[PDB]
Structures are given as C-alpha cells and as structure tokens.
C-alpha cells in the first residue's frame, strides 16, 4: 500500500519541486507519512533536496541577522518596521520572527531529515544561531533594564511624574506652552502594554510609574491639544498679525495663565467653550 | 396535504429552491430565507409580467405556460397559473 | 390605483387633472413612454406651453418651474414628476 | 416668475411571506397538482440533458492579465517624505480616499497630516491633484465611507481623536468629532466601521478600535461633538483563552488591538486582531464589566467570547467572507496569512507569503475563493483557492525601489478594481484579469466543501 | 424646440427617441459570431433530438 | 456550413421559426417574413434586457446564459451574447 | 461608474461638462435630488439659465428642449437626464 502511495507522493513532490515554500509545506501537511521507514527510504533524494533548501535558508537567516543586528531600527539595513512600534519593540518582534523560522526549520528537519550526515552538522549550526538570537536579545534586555531605571530617575524631564509636579507651563523665557508629561512616557505605556500583551513579566518599579502615567496620560493628551493649539496659533502670527486675534485669544489665555482632578476637569470644561470660539476664528485667518 | 408536496419538490435531483407567489405579487412559504424569498419573489414577479405580455404581444389569442432561465451559477424554472406562479432552482449539471 | 401626494404649487383642478390624466394613461398603456407622452400632450392641449414629464419607481430631481405650476405625486408603486418651464 | 424645486422617491417597502389559512388552500393544492406533473417531467429532463456541456456566453472583453494605469499622490505631503496607509471606496463607487501619516517609529505626531479624495470617473482626474484635500494637525490613519451617502467618511487619529468628514460641503468639510472626553481613545487608533443604529437601522454610527484595547461606538450631535453608547475593553485576564496562552498578568492592563471584520449574515459577530498576536471573537452583547481604572460616561465591558490559535506576533488585518458566515482571514508580522472558521480554534489553513512583514487581507466582492494580501517588500498578491491549494496565483511589484507597500481595498460596484498604497506617499489602482472579475462554476459549493474538509 | 422620450431600463438599446444598416457589416461578417451560430444551433438540435427521443 | 444548419432546424418535426438579431432589435438571418421577424426580434431583445437585469438583481455575481418560453400554441428558445442572439420557435411537446 | 449613452443634440463642451458635473455629483451625494441639485446648479451658473436635471434607476420621461441643449446618459446602474427649457 505504501509503495503505491509513495509513487503518488513522489509524483506530487515532483510537481511542487520548484518552490521551497511549497516543498516544506507539503512535507508539513504529509509529515506523518514521510516519518515512516519504507516511505522515508523511497523519498531519499527528496529528503536531501529539502535538507539543501533548509541549509540555504539557515545561511540566509544568519546573513540577514549579520547585516541587521547593529543596523538602525526600522531602516532597510536594520530590523523591520511594524505599525507604530518603538525601537526596542520593533527589535524584539523582529528577533522573535528569526527565532520562529530557525526553530521551525530545526523541528521539521528533526522529524523528517535526521538520518542524514549533513543534518548533524547543520543542526548544530541552526541551534547555535538560535542560542545566539536568545543571547543578543538578553543583552538588549540587560541594557534596557539599566537604561529604563536610570531614565525613570529623571522625573523632572517628564520621564516619571510626582503628582505634586506641575500640570502645564507658559514659560515666559520662550512664550511657549509646555506640558510636563514626556512623549517617552506615552511610549512607555505602549511599551509596557505591548510587552504584557505578548507575555513579558513587568518589573515592579516600571509598573508603579505606569500606574501614575496611565491616569495622567488622559490629562496629558488633553493638555497637549491645548499646548499645540496655543503654540501653532502663536507661530501662525508674526507680531504684525497678533493683537486682533489676541483679544479673542485673551479669553483662552486667561485659562492658560491660570495654570500659574476636579480643578483640572472644571478648567478643561471652561477651556472647551473658549476653544469653540478660538478654533472658529483660527480658520478665518488661515 | 400541501406541505408534503413541497417536500416532494424539495427532494428533486440537483435542486434547492422553491418559492410560490400569488397573482397579487405576494410570496408563500419557502426552503430559502425571507431576505432571499422577498428578493426572488419580487424580481421574478416583475419579469413574469413582462413575459406574459411578450407572448400576448406576439399573439393576443395565445397564452404562456412555462419559462426557463439558465445562468452561470444555476438554472431557474418558472410555472404560472390563475392565482399562483412557482419558482424552482436547480444547481449546475 | 391608490393616489398619494406631497409637494406642489398648482390650483386644485390642475392637481386632479394630473392624477386623472396619469390614471387614464396607465389603463391605456403598459409602457412608461406612452404615460409620460400622454401626460405632456394633454397638459399642452388644455393649458399653455411648456411642459415636461417623468414617470418612475425611482428618481430624484432638481428643476426650475413657473409659479402656480409644479407637482410630484404617486399612483401605487409609481411616482410622477410634472413641471412647466419654457 | 421662476422658482427652483427638489423632489425625491422614498425607499421601497419590503414584501412579506403570507400564512396559508387566510386563502382558499384547495386552489393552491389544485395548482400544485397541475404544476408538479409538468415540473416532475421538466426537472427530470433538465437533470438528464446534455444541452449545455461546454456551453459559454460573453458579456465583457477577456483581459488576460492583472493590469494598471493610475498613480495618486499629493505633492505637498510627498515633499515631506510622508507615508500612507488608508484606502476606502465610496457607496457610488466614484471615490477612492487616502490618508497620510508616518508610522515609521511611532514617533510623536505634531507633524502635518492630510486626507485626500480622488473621483476616478472624472475626465478632470489628474495624478498630482486630489479631487478634494483636508488637513489635520496630527497623523490620521483610517478611512471608512458611509454605506449610503458617498461624501461621508470617518477616520481615527494618532493621540486618540475620531473625526468625521462630509465632502459634500468642502468650505467646511469636517464637523463631527470627539474633542476630548472621558469616553475617548488615547493611544494610536486605526480602524473604522459604520454600523446601523439599533431599531433605527437606516441611520448609522461610527465604530473605533485602538492600541488602547478599547472598542467604542459613536454618533454626532451639534457643533464639534460626538456622543458615545457602547464601550468595551480588552482587559487581559477577563477574556476566555486557548491553551497556548499562560495565566495572564494584571487585568488592570488591556491588550491593544487594530482589526475589525463583521460576519455579514449576523451583525452581532465581529472579529478583533491584537498586539498579543491572537485573534478574538466578539459579540456587541457581552455584559461582563471590565474594571478598568479610567472613567467613561458608559462603563466598559469585555467585548469577546472566544480566542483563536495565535500568529508569531502582532496582528494588523482581519477580513470576513461575504459568502460563508463562519469564515475569516488574518494577516500579521510573522510573514503568514491564516484562515479560520468561527466554530473552531485551529486555523483551517496557514500560508507563508513573504520572508518580510505583511499587512493586508481582503476577500473579493465577486469570487468566494479569491483573497488578496500585501507585503513590506513592495508587493501585492492575489490567491485563487479554486485553482491551487498551495501556490499564489498573481504577484505584483508596486514600488521600484522596494519601499514598503501596505493597503488593499476592492471597489464597491466596479468590482474589477483593487487599490493599494505605499511608503512613497502614493496609491495605485489595479484592474484584475477576467478570471478574478466574474464568478467561477460551483464556487459557493467549493467554499462550503473547503470549510467542511477539516471540520474537527 | 425638440421633443425627446427616454427610459431606464430600456425597451431596447434604442434608449431614447425624438418626435440595411452599418451595424450589420461587422455583425453578419464576424467569424466569432458565425461560430456562435454553430454552437447555438448545436444546442437547439440536441434539445430537439432529446424531445423527440422522449416523445417517440 | 451555417445555412445548412438553419435548413436542418427548419426541417424538424413541428418546427418553423428561426431569427438572428443584431442587439438593436433588428434581424440579420430569418426563415420568416421581415415584419414578423422584426416583431419577434424587438420583443425578444426587450425581454433579454429585462432577463439579464433580473438575474443581476437576483445575484450581481451571476449572469444570464439561456432563455426558454412555452406558450399554449408554441415554444420559443433564446440563446444570447453581448453582440448577437438566436431565436428558434417550435410546436408544443 | 462607467458611462453608456444614446441621444445627440448639444455642443461637445456641454457633453463634457454635463458628464463631469454629474461625476462630481456622485462624489457629492447619493440621495438623488441632491445629485440633480449639483448638476443643475453648475449648469445654471456657467450657461444661460434655466436648467432641469433628474437622476433615477427606474423611470420613463417625455420632455421638450431648446436647440443644441439636451443630454441623457447611464452611469453604472443609474440614469441621468439634463436639459434646458426657459
């Protein structure tokens, strides 16, 4: 029965033979047949052919890592880019995709191909590559552990927040409006969440700052709409253009100068009435 | 009495459709869902009004008794009388 | 047929004339060509020129019209649009 | 004197099935006796007959290849090197619309952003000149077009606001928006779907999904304001899960998401894709309160009631079949596309489509067995699952420098059109070969057999 | 002034009207349309032969 | 070739109608007088346009391939394409 | 929505403008009165007034028009009528 089945298998394998993806995916779909000893002896050149495809695939995965491992995050010479991920989060996702393909290559070769003399030589190489991916990822997490804890110490930059630190500030040295919640803390909530969602353990200190930063994140995004509206309506006007809009802006600017939860949310409610007026007049000058 | 004949028509070789429609344009029970039944009953009612005119327009002393439509998905059958018309659909063979 | 009506500017005799002229055409002819043809031809015959007619199960429109002459009305499943300009 | 008038035909009344006792049922029985005598003869002849063996007819020119000539871009956006991923097609099939925002490192979007609309029917169509343009002071990345009014398009922002435009009033193209309230998103948003208002289903509401791990349903009233009425959170402990997932960390953490697709025959059922790499099944009726710390005017609940087998990392697209209620496709960071049935936790099929990252998946509006996918190498691909079980049927190279490509949408009514968008601030529109454009023999039966083949 | 009638859907491809043919030159002559008569008459002939085999 | 195939159909038991139509309601082959040929051609062209429309309203992903029309005096059969169509007419069976 | 046409009396610039304005009306609206409102409003603005426009997928019509001004056309599964009278 196997001999007649193996004739049809060897025919189907010969139809797909041009593509290494189709060959590997057929060897997955019919793996339990290819395991059996007489069928394994009937398909010996096809086993050596898949070994050659997988050995070249391990060369290509290591060559891609050798170029990328010290290249710039997201750039075509470095780790690939997903939607809205950070430098570290792109780097981790990219490394785990290399691990996944090297690990699947090892597992499929182990069941199907492990009689062959080349399989011992190349299994050692593929396992060693997979351990080098683990080790280099761990070196990135050791650097991340130091560098997040040292960054979090600089709360005055906005990398961490005291609740008794300032909401928003009209810095009279610049005339600009500033919000003390750093852009890096908004990235830290994305980072800690995406790490948790994929399955990482989060350090206690990082979780404590993330708790403070979560509730403040709602407020900080409101405060950044106000701050960017003020900084952009200021930059739209050279002093030759200002005093006329400055009368309407003086209602909104009284609330901004009063920066010098219930206080802030009542302040925001008044500020949204002033924003209907000011945003309508901003469009008129544009 | 009637529902047993509907099972007899549902049982046919390569077939899955029944709709009966009344001369006022309103459908009776079907093995299709109500969205599909409404769509088929209304559309084919308009098409059969044109069909019965077309045969009478060729000869006012003639009248119409059966119709077929074959299509890329399926064949459709139509059979009208005084108070009712039937739709049947046969899967492609 | 059942008659249902909404948006208009004409004296009541002209509203009733549009309903009757369309009803009599719908008995006389099975094809919308002859319905719209008869509605214009009777309006041009009784009234002064110039008249335009549309007869459909689905339409929307924007048009110019002369004061005391516009109507839109339904006779069963079919709607009719009838206006004077020219 | 002259006046101008407007009039409109109202929507058609739906007909109803009638119960039997109301009529003279013996006349239906006598009719069925006469008609069954003929119909028995004629159905046996039609079952027997050779009359259509190899018979064919034509209604279109047999175009031999998937082929294109369009290039859509806004030069003021392109001069800044901005990236694009949004496509939507309007209800009249006239407009394709597009949105510019850099996703490149997720970096803080105080940068300019544009929404662009092209009406491809225009004899005044030009490559470098959108039919309409609107600006936003932070990155926009969604569009969905309203299911009836063709001017109406809804989109989500970096930093969490939702905006709704009406391109029928281009001197004031934009007023329906959240502002900011306790109801809102905060982290980057990208999904929109339009959903009918419960009990008032000729009206429509905007749905939004975000890297927050919130799902929200919105409506507009008055100047510059949206109001909310359904709210869900992906609180990580609460959802029911498959054995590849460990005992989950703090339930006060959400799992972020961006996909939506609805099972089109039963509108309670929607599918979500996640930052955690697992697809979810979700119901618009799941009542379990979320216990999220943050306030909202309507309290948050778990949206989900099932978890499917995971991808190798984050998911960025999902789509549901318009022909079989149970089926959806997913695409993610691992170089693979998977098919699932909403009855079973394993994938019905898995395919690898690149060595690099992917994100698009869509089903043809005409063909039950056609799906399309798009790739960060700069390519678009189409698969005909009636022609092969393993090999992609068409591959298309969109960027000559191999800069990243990610969008797919199929046109609403000119169903021969598929459009795709890319990192060089551009969208291109592809007309498919006739084999994609018109339905094959027994494809609905073959899709039922495909789902049945590994019913397990 | 000129008068016009017009419809959707049409009663033919003569979609509008006011108050041998050139189209025949390609239509009679085309070898593809001559082949469609080979095919359509083959269908008619097997339908007639099936109806005679049922009748006789 | 084709003319002999029309003569074959003209000879069959209880058969006499053959018309070919230009998709402008006007005929290009006939075994009948031109006035009656034009009556059947224009009526069948109207009826094909409504048939194809009806199939696309029933299912926009489907399309028409054949039509058959049975009347108490005769049966009519219709085979359509984009550019051209055949009508054939026979006594009942 | 691709176009299909059979009628002929207007100058070619007016044929171009009428199809283009209706195309812009298809991005502007679906509710057919508003589609026809765009088409008519631009024709009354550029050309000499007054214009009439209708948009429908199930209608018949009979109308009279000034010399060198009429068009009727199908866009996809919908039909459009545009003419000057008055």
Author numbering:
A (entry chain B): 395 to 654, 668 to 693
B (entry chain H), F (entry chain G): 3 to 95
C (entry chain I), G (entry chain J): 4 to 89
D (entry chain D): 81 to 536
E (entry chain C): 551 to 569, 575 to 611
Q: What are the paper's exact sentences on this?
A:
Dynein-2 is a large multiprotein complex that powers retrograde intraflagellar transport (IFT) of cargoes within cilia/flagella, but the molecular mechanism underlying this function is still emerging. Dynein-2 is the essential motor for retrograde intraflagellar transport (IFT), the conserved process in which polymeric IFT “trains” translocate cargoes along the ciliary microtubules. A 3.9 Å resolution structure shows how WDR34 and WDR60 use surprisingly different interactions to engage equivalent sites of the two heavy chains.
Notably, a loop from bundle 3 of DYNC2H1 positions a lysine residue (K477) directly into the pore of the WDR34 β-propeller domain, whose mouth is lined by highly conserved residues (bottom row). In contrast, WDR34 uses a classic β-propeller mode interaction to engage DYNC2H1, accommodating a lysine side chain within its central pore. Lacking the insert in its third blade, the WDR34 β-propeller allows the associated copy of DYNC2H1 to adopt a bent conformation. In contrast, the copy of DYNC2H1 associated with WDR34 is bent. These straight and bent conformers of DYNC2H1 represent extreme ends of the range of heavy chain conformations observed in other dyneins. The only notable shared interaction that WDR34 and WDR60 use to engage DYNC2H1 involves E355 (WDR34)/D881 (WDR60) contacting R587 of DYNC2H1. DYNC2H1 mutation R587C is associated with severe short-rib thoracic dysplasia. The regions of WDR34 and WDR60 N-proximal to the β-propeller domains are held together by a tower of dimeric light chains (one DYNLRB1 homodimer and three DYNLL1 homodimers).
